[PDB]
DNA sequence: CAGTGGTCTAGACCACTGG
DNA sequence: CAGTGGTCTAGACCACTGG
């Protein structure tokens, strides 16, 4: 029971997908089940179908609908979420308060290797956390960020780097390796010396296609196993 | 230069897409420059301004190219690698792959293994091969299909060389280890392989991408 | 067959951007 | 200001599925 206001400043298109968005969440509509006509949609509404297709073609391109030549547009197959994820969200999608513990900030400059970021010769912010779940430390997490890139701050937080400049946030490297504790990491996380841990090395770049972080993070072997689903 | 075949069965937009891919990688267009106009290829072409923002739109939707509102259209610098076997995985390294099998069976189902996919208690193919990259053992692999492309499910989590583990793959007992349950699932929406797979950690790094809007 | 998505056209106004 | 992507319209032919 769809409604779309022509006048509104707020675009048709996102008005369908939003609604529809809805619509399928609260199982109004139903997986392998077509829905109304492009044609049809067009009309109901009173809108050009290339209107409705745009619409309907961003839902298709993230999942949630499917199409089939001379039968239709039909409802999906429900999904899963995790890619892009930082600690905190990955966190509340296990079920769990994250938290977090400053023990580290310095202002470094640049070996060639931390040049490899996309280094705009700089002063770099090094912010080393201790990442927590339900108050466990879950992970250690040292964070790498130019002021060519952020400049400075007092944080007291992903946003402030799209906002800092043009660009937004799009695509992540992250490589895993395996290791055994060392007594400052075995110390801090609170494990047994030599006790598995997971080393995890993860760049973000901008939609630039420009990388602003370079983040070397040691997880627990015990409490926290890696989930990713590709594809 | 660029060109348009308005007649053939592959559409205009994808004429334009994969050629504009080569431009991009062959470095003929650079990075923080931007294209020419949406009306612009419109017009040089000869074409309509919709059926190219189809073309840039995908590329935009595909990493490729992003878009500043009152400005343009400019490119992106980044490299490719996406959906792995251990063989794609390897020769992506500058690496010729191997397998040496060294354990074949079918047993019954156990309920946990049975919970993916369906029906247990039927029949389970488990191959277990040691991976090798040139010739070097990288892995030992359990692959686990019934006999009865889309999405992939890999789960991470560190460990230390049982004694029969490092014995194959020819390293120190308690060595650092990479433990990989790598679950894949058809179009159909059932799953196809689990596979259980143990990593030496020295000679081993896993790799991974990631997107999000 | 009448219906459907996939593609395409030749125009249109808007909000936004930089100089 | 003039240019750009962001949105929208009212038509169109195609190749394809189903009864």
């Given at each position: 029971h769809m409604n779309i206001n022509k006048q509104s400043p707020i675009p048709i298109y996102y008005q369908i997908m939003e609604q529809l968005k809805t619509q399928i969440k609260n199982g109004e509509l139903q997986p392998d089940m077509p829905?109304?006509?492009?044609?049809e949609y067009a009309e109901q509404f009173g809108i050009s179908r290339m209107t409705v297709r745009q619409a309907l073609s961003n839902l298709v391109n993230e999942g949630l609908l499917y199409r089939l030549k001379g039968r239709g547009t039909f409802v999906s197959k429900p999904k899963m979420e995790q890619g892009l994820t930082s600690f905190t969200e990955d966190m509340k999608s296990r079920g769990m308060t994250p938290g977090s513990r400053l023990i580290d900030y310095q202002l470094i400059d640049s070996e060639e290797l931390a040049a490899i970021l996309g280094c705009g010769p700089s002063s770099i912010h090094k912010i080393t956390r201790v990442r927590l779940a339900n108050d466990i430390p879950m992970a250690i997490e040292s964070s790498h960020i130019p002021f060519e890139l952020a400049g400075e701050l007092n944080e007291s937080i992903y946003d402030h780097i799209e906002r800092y400049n043009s660009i937004p946030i799009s695509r992540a490297k992250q490589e895993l390796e395996p290791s055994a504790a060392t007594t400052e990491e075995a110390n801090i996380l609170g494990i047994?010396?030599?006790?598995?841990?997971?080393?995890?090395?993860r760049t973000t770049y901008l939609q630039n296609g420009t990388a602003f972080e370079?983040?070397?993070?040691?997880?627990?072997?015990?409490r926290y196993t890696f989930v990713h689903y590709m594809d």
């Open positions: 829905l109304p006509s492009e044609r047994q010396k030599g006790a598995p841990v997971l080393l995890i090395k370079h983040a070397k993070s040691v997880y627990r072997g015990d």
